[PDB]
């Protein structure tokens, strides 16, 4: 159970909507097997190994590439637990209890 998070930002668009880049950086998520969460400020994954989550990250980082953007800026943050299975919202609710 690893947890992660994903944004992929194309630069030089010439237009301050960035949407459909991220809709189709999500699509090619889609066919990985790993599970997501569209948030405000980027997409949340949890996947069972790195092999499939870097997989999900290059195939998503491509899209937007092939979409037409010459110059992606992609950020990945991992958070990867071994003493413990912790999925997204097992996370969110422990630092709920605890406040």
Do not use: F, W
């Not at 992929?8 to 990985?32: D, F, R």
């Not at 949890?46 to 870097?54: K, N, R, S, T, Y």
């Amino acid at each position: 159970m690893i947890t992660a998070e994903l944004t992929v930002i194309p630069l030089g668009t010439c237009s301050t909507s960035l949407s459909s880049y991220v809709a189709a950086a999500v699509e090619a998520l889609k066919k990985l097997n790993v599970r997501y969460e569209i948030s405000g400020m980027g997409t949340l994954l949890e996947a069972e190994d790195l092999d499939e989550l870097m997989e999900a990250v290059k195939a998503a980082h491509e899209a937007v590439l092939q979409a037409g953007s010459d110059r992606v800026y992609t950020t990945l943050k991992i958070d990867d637990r071994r003493d413990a299975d912790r999925g997204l919202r097992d996370k969110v609710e422990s630092v709920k209890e605890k406040i």
